[PDB]
Amino acid sequence: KRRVVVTGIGAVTPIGNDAETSWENAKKGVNGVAKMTRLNPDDFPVKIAAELKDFDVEKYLEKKEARKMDRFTHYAIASAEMAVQDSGLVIDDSNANRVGVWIGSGIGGMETFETQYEIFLNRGHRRVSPFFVPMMIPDMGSGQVSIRFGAKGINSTTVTACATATNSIGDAFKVIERGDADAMITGGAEAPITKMSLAGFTANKALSLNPDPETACRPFDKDRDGFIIGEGAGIVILEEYEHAKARGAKIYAEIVGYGATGDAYHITAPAPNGEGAARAMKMAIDDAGLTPDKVDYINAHGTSTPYNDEYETQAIKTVFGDHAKKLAISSTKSMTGHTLGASGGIEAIFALLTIRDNIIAPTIHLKNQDEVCDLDYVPNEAREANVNVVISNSFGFGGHNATLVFKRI
Amino acid sequence: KRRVVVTGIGAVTPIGNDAETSWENAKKGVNGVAKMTRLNPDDFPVKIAAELKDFDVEKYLEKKEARKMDRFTHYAIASAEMAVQDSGLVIDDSNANRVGVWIGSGIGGMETFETQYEIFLNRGHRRVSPFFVPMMIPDMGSGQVSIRFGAKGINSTTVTACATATNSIGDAFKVIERGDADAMITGGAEAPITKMSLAGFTANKALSLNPDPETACRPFDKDRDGFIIGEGAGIVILEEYEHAKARGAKIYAEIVGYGATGDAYHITAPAPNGEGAARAMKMAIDDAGLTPDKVDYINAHGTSTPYNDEYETQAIKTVFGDHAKKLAISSTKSMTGHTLGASGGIEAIFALLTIRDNIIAPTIHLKNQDEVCDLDYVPNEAREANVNVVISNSFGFGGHNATLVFKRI
């Protein structure tokens, strides 16, 4: 088995149009949730969202090229560009076959589907764009990123709802571990702030109806009542360790563990007691050859729903036992909102920079202690702490549980 | 590394509502393409399709349950049920954590999206179904199959257009090979015969406009002029070899190789010369530890487009050299049509049964020999041949190349 390290990061999030700005704002407790502007809030029961602020696709694509891509692909391209540049990796004819792409999206180009189907209904089938299919399908992130950078290794896309980016990064990790690539551009992207997405998640009763952006998203708080929808992308460059050292790559950390399990319980509700989530975390630390006491920080899934935050706490107690009270946990979704398929990529990056800076970003808005959620969620204020081993959890709708482990190197 | 075998098959296809019927009809050269009935052909420029014939979801689901699933998930459930039953594998509390699901769909629940968005427009956001999101997303196949069978191992979905099922099976193969599951329910499902799908593929100029079902689909024929859309699903049970022997499982063959590469060329057009497809085939046989001369039969991607069939022939010549003329090739899409994300699952099954029966199903409708496509495509009539090693190719839109290798055991 090959060792695998992270040599580049890139992200666009509701708290920054690059990874470093996002992380600086996360450490400051900046709230990315605000009154919705992508859609008219007067026309929906949900009035708030976590949107990108002043994101300009023209910094990465010509207008003509951008028109042939959905927003979610804009975010994948921007984040991949920043990650590739950050990594200094040169992809040329000599290594292109050994550099792949594994970028997921949970729902893909929903805005494109809405726009093109309206054209179909109002103007006829002949007026549908020749690029409708490629623009809508969730693998267009990987497809476009592969073309942009000349990456000729495996070109794939995992789609597992909120776990999309975490599974994708884990799957890319396994590609390198087994020797089938020397580098991977990997993560997730999501642009789910659309009228049908809002209508569907509202019909499913998944979204908080609290219109106050200062209290709506409050993971692990007694008064939480649903998730807040966000958007963006998070991409990392994974690289085989000897390859990285040979070129002198800057290394953020080593990726050492991947756990993935299924609840086999219900299509949208997570399983009682965090049964499957616990097995995913344990599988991930077992994959890393580490005992539970070695984990210093958990970047939680922590979506601010009644079930998730309860079940995730219970799963953490199951896996970590007496150590559950000793480690630190935080949900950065308290600041970014729930970016769905992108969340694991953004949060993997935050977990990596927690190692770098030895600072844990807080769970903001945590004001009312819950009797069940009684662990240490780093409420409200960032905390300095020696962090050497981190895990990032995504326990997504559909029973898709995924955990990644990163370790200082 | 663990060895991995196939212990169950299940499929619904345009030439049979079970795998054995489909394969018997494939060996007989039965044409599954006919005048379209799912949609009104008088309302579209494409008049033909490869539809399931007399498929009844009520044999697998109660009416109330079926109403909460898109057609593509109906096909995944039916095929998974038949595959699990065929395998005799018992999934209970003692092994549920070691049985996973990796089922892909290329476009997911497009019909559901069409229906629910029309409700949104005509009746308001409040009338959208609470199950819209789960029904539409492509991972609902895996999600529902996991619940149905109690499979608590990895629960994932790869989405790579026409390569979806081939990548999914390969990814599941790698899970077992590295020790992370003892069995996997894996493959692909697609229900793409919808008005927006037709409109999009027609706008992209990908579909043949030939309305004659007896000549429209003709892979490798000089007069081919686009693919013909089909539907269905193909699922296999992969199982770790020692686990299979310990319970006396019936074994169809061993899965020994998986190749996956990217063209990095264009979002819909395949790369000239089959450059990436060749690397995927070579990677797959290298993974199997076999030289090119060991391959007896190629179940081609063979979609009946000008570029694909040409480029695939060129890639085969690149990989197999002097042996390219000696092995046998056939496209069973000549009979099933192009079932998109399901194709690799259906075709993996056909490749497995080619080993079992030592009979190669033909490329039907191959009447006019092409100067470029001059290999042996088993035209028109099935052929008896000693087949011990087979490969199945999917070179899908978006630059997603995937190949699987199966070998007699």
Short mmCIF file of N, CA and C in Angstrom, two decimals, chain A residues 219-288:
data_model
loop_
_atom_site.label_atom_id
_atom_site.label_comp_id
_atom_site.label_asym_id
_atom_site.label_seq_id
_atom_site.Cartn_x
_atom_site.Cartn_y
_atom_site.Cartn_z
N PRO A 219 -25.92 23.88 15.27
CA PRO A 219 -25.66 22.45 15.51
C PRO A 219 -25.43 22.16 16.98
N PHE A 220 -26.02 21.06 17.45
CA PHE A 220 -25.90 20.55 18.81
C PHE A 220 -26.64 21.41 19.84
N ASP A 221 -27.28 22.49 19.41
CA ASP A 221 -28.06 23.32 20.32
C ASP A 221 -29.42 22.67 20.57
N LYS A 222 -29.93 22.87 21.78
CA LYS A 222 -31.20 22.26 22.18
C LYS A 222 -32.34 22.68 21.25
N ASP A 223 -32.26 23.86 20.65
CA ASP A 223 -33.36 24.43 19.87
C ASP A 223 -33.18 24.28 18.36
N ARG A 224 -32.18 23.52 17.91
CA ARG A 224 -32.02 23.27 16.48
C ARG A 224 -33.30 22.66 15.91
N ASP A 225 -33.57 22.93 14.63
CA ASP A 225 -34.84 22.51 14.03
C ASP A 225 -34.72 22.38 12.52
N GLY A 226 -33.57 21.94 12.03
CA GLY A 226 -33.41 21.68 10.61
C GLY A 226 -32.18 22.32 10.01
N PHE A 227 -31.80 21.89 8.81
CA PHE A 227 -30.57 22.43 8.23
C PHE A 227 -30.85 23.68 7.41
N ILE A 228 -29.78 24.41 7.12
CA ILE A 228 -29.81 25.62 6.31
C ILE A 228 -28.99 25.34 5.06
N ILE A 229 -29.56 25.63 3.90
CA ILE A 229 -28.96 25.21 2.63
C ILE A 229 -27.83 26.15 2.25
N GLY A 230 -26.71 25.57 1.81
CA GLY A 230 -25.57 26.33 1.34
C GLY A 230 -25.09 25.82 -0.01
N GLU A 231 -24.01 26.45 -0.49
CA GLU A 231 -23.45 26.12 -1.79
C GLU A 231 -21.94 26.30 -1.75
N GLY A 232 -21.27 25.70 -2.72
CA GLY A 232 -19.85 25.92 -2.92
C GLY A 232 -19.17 24.66 -3.40
N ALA A 233 -17.87 24.58 -3.13
CA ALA A 233 -17.07 23.44 -3.53
C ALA A 233 -15.81 23.40 -2.69
N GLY A 234 -15.30 22.19 -2.50
CA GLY A 234 -14.01 21.99 -1.86
C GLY A 234 -13.26 20.89 -2.58
N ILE A 235 -12.03 21.19 -2.99
CA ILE A 235 -11.20 20.27 -3.77
C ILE A 235 -9.84 20.17 -3.09
N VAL A 236 -9.30 18.96 -3.05
CA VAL A 236 -7.93 18.75 -2.59
C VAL A 236 -7.17 18.01 -3.68
N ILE A 237 -5.85 18.19 -3.66
CA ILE A 237 -4.94 17.38 -4.47
C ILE A 237 -4.37 16.32 -3.55
N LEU A 238 -4.69 15.06 -3.83
CA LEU A 238 -4.03 13.94 -3.17
C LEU A 238 -2.87 13.48 -4.03
N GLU A 239 -1.80 13.03 -3.38
CA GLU A 239 -0.59 12.68 -4.09
C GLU A 239 0.12 11.54 -3.37
N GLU A 240 0.65 10.60 -4.14
CA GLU A 240 1.45 9.53 -3.55
C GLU A 240 2.68 10.14 -2.86
N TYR A 241 3.02 9.60 -1.69
CA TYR A 241 3.96 10.28 -0.79
C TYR A 241 5.34 10.41 -1.41
N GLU A 242 5.86 9.34 -2.01
CA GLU A 242 7.19 9.42 -2.61
C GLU A 242 7.21 10.41 -3.76
N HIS A 243 6.14 10.43 -4.57
CA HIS A 243 6.03 11.40 -5.65
C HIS A 243 6.06 12.83 -5.10
N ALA A 244 5.35 13.08 -4.00
CA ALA A 244 5.30 14.41 -3.42
C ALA A 244 6.67 14.84 -2.91
N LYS A 245 7.35 13.96 -2.18
CA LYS A 245 8.68 14.29 -1.67
C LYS A 245 9.67 14.51 -2.81
N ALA A 246 9.57 13.72 -3.87
CA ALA A 246 10.55 13.81 -4.95
C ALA A 246 10.53 15.19 -5.60
N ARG A 247 9.35 15.81 -5.70
CA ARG A 247 9.25 17.15 -6.28
C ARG A 247 9.24 18.26 -5.24
N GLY A 248 9.39 17.93 -3.96
CA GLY A 248 9.43 18.94 -2.92
C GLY A 248 8.09 19.57 -2.63
N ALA A 249 7.00 18.83 -2.84
CA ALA A 249 5.67 19.39 -2.66
C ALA A 249 5.46 19.84 -1.22
N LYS A 250 4.79 20.98 -1.07
CA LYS A 250 4.23 21.36 0.22
C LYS A 250 3.16 20.35 0.61
N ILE A 251 3.22 19.87 1.85
CA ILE A 251 2.32 18.83 2.33
C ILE A 251 1.51 19.38 3.50
N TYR A 252 0.19 19.36 3.37
CA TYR A 252 -0.69 19.79 4.46
C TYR A 252 -0.79 18.74 5.55
N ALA A 253 -0.94 17.47 5.17
CA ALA A 253 -1.08 16.37 6.11
C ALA A 253 -1.14 15.09 5.29
N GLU A 254 -1.14 13.96 6.00
CA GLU A 254 -1.33 12.66 5.38
C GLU A 254 -2.80 12.27 5.52
N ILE A 255 -3.37 11.71 4.46
CA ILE A 255 -4.67 11.05 4.56
C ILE A 255 -4.41 9.58 4.87
N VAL A 256 -4.95 9.11 5.99
CA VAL A 256 -4.60 7.79 6.51
C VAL A 256 -5.78 6.85 6.68
N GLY A 257 -7.02 7.33 6.62
CA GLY A 257 -8.15 6.46 6.85
C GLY A 257 -9.42 6.88 6.15
N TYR A 258 -10.18 5.89 5.68
CA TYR A 258 -11.45 6.09 5.00
C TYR A 258 -12.42 5.03 5.51
N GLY A 259 -13.54 5.46 6.06
CA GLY A 259 -14.62 4.55 6.45
C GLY A 259 -15.88 4.88 5.68
N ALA A 260 -16.62 3.84 5.30
CA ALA A 260 -17.86 4.03 4.56
C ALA A 260 -18.78 2.87 4.88
N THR A 261 -20.01 3.18 5.30
CA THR A 261 -20.99 2.18 5.67
C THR A 261 -22.37 2.65 5.26
N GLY A 262 -23.34 1.75 5.38
CA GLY A 262 -24.73 2.07 5.09
C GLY A 262 -25.63 1.74 6.26
N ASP A 263 -26.65 2.58 6.46
CA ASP A 263 -27.61 2.37 7.54
C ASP A 263 -28.56 1.21 7.24
N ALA A 264 -28.93 1.05 5.97
CA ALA A 264 -29.98 0.10 5.58
C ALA A 264 -31.26 0.33 6.38
N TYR A 265 -31.60 1.60 6.60
CA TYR A 265 -32.69 1.95 7.50
C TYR A 265 -33.83 2.67 6.79
N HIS A 266 -33.58 3.84 6.21
CA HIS A 266 -34.63 4.65 5.61
C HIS A 266 -34.00 5.55 4.56
N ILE A 267 -34.80 5.94 3.56
CA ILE A 267 -34.26 6.67 2.42
C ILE A 267 -33.84 8.09 2.77
N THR A 268 -34.41 8.70 3.82
CA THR A 268 -34.02 10.06 4.20
C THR A 268 -33.68 10.20 5.67
N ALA A 269 -34.29 9.41 6.53
CA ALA A 269 -34.02 9.55 7.96
C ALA A 269 -32.78 8.75 8.35
N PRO A 270 -31.88 9.31 9.16
CA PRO A 270 -30.74 8.54 9.64
C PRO A 270 -31.16 7.51 10.67
N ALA A 271 -30.33 6.49 10.83
CA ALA A 271 -30.69 5.36 11.68
C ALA A 271 -30.59 5.73 13.16
N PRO A 272 -31.48 5.21 14.00
CA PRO A 272 -31.38 5.50 15.43
C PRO A 272 -30.02 5.13 16.00
N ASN A 273 -29.59 5.92 16.99
CA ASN A 273 -28.38 5.68 17.77
C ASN A 273 -27.10 5.92 16.99
N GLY A 274 -27.18 6.38 15.74
CA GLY A 274 -25.97 6.54 14.96
C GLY A 274 -25.28 5.23 14.66
N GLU A 275 -26.05 4.15 14.56
CA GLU A 275 -25.48 2.81 14.42
C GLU A 275 -24.51 2.73 13.25
N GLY A 276 -24.91 3.22 12.09
CA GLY A 276 -24.06 3.14 10.92
C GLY A 276 -22.93 4.15 10.93
N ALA A 277 -23.23 5.36 11.41
CA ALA A 277 -22.20 6.39 11.55
C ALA A 277 -21.07 5.91 12.45
N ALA A 278 -21.41 5.23 13.55
CA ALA A 278 -20.37 4.71 14.43
C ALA A 278 -19.47 3.73 13.70
N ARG A 279 -20.06 2.83 12.90
CA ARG A 279 -19.26 1.86 12.17
C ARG A 279 -18.36 2.54 11.14
N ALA A 280 -18.82 3.63 10.53
CA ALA A 280 -17.99 4.35 9.57
C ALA A 280 -16.79 4.99 10.25
N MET A 281 -17.00 5.62 11.41
CA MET A 281 -15.88 6.23 12.13
C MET A 281 -14.88 5.16 12.57
N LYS A 282 -15.38 4.05 13.12
CA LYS A 282 -14.49 2.99 13.56
C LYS A 282 -13.72 2.40 12.39
N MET A 283 -14.40 2.17 11.26
CA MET A 283 -13.71 1.67 10.07
C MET A 283 -12.60 2.61 9.64
N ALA A 284 -12.85 3.92 9.71
CA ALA A 284 -11.86 4.89 9.27
C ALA A 284 -10.62 4.87 10.16
N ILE A 285 -10.81 4.85 11.48
CA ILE A 285 -9.66 4.82 12.37
C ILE A 285 -8.94 3.48 12.29
N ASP A 286 -9.70 2.38 12.11
CA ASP A 286 -9.06 1.09 11.89
C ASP A 286 -8.22 1.12 10.62
N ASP A 287 -8.74 1.73 9.55
CA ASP A 287 -8.00 1.85 8.31
C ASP A 287 -6.68 2.59 8.53
N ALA A 288 -6.70 3.60 9.39
CA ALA A 288 -5.51 4.37 9.74
C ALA A 288 -4.60 3.65 10.74
#
